[PDB]
């Protein structure tokens, strides 16, 4: 037929290709590195604060 290139599993938990996961894991950085600049430099709110308009005079 087509080919044998991988056999199935009886729940012996098949093996990976070893370039399958590493090539992916470099994209586990792109969320954890690109999350860098969140708190640097930005705070929970970069706003300025309303100073309670006391001068009703």
């Amino acid at each position: 037929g087509g080919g044998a290139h991988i056999e199935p599993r009886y729940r012996q938990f098949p093996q990976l290709t070893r370039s399958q996961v590493i090539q992916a894991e470099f994209f586990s950085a792109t969320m954890w590195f690109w999350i860098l600049w969140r708190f640097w430099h930005d705070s929970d709110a970069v706003l300025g604060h309303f100073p309670y308009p006391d001068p009703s005079q």
Binding site: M31, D44, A45
Partner: protein
């Protein structure tokens, strides 16, 4: 292609626009992360209930 064109996307699209409106930009406390404030315990109630 997507996940790469995902993360960078939101900032590229947004960063380049002629601004069409005025957002308030003065956001007092307790109105602020009030969404994030809810999700924080969502995950709490996610796993605790799972």
């Amino acid at each position: 292609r997507l996940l790469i064109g995902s993360l960078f996307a939101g900032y590229i699209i947004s960063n380049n626009i002629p601004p069409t409106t005025i957002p308030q930009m003065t956001m007092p406390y307790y109105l602020k992360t009030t969404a994030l404030i809810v999700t924080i315990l969502g995950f709490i109630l996610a796993l605790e209930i799972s």
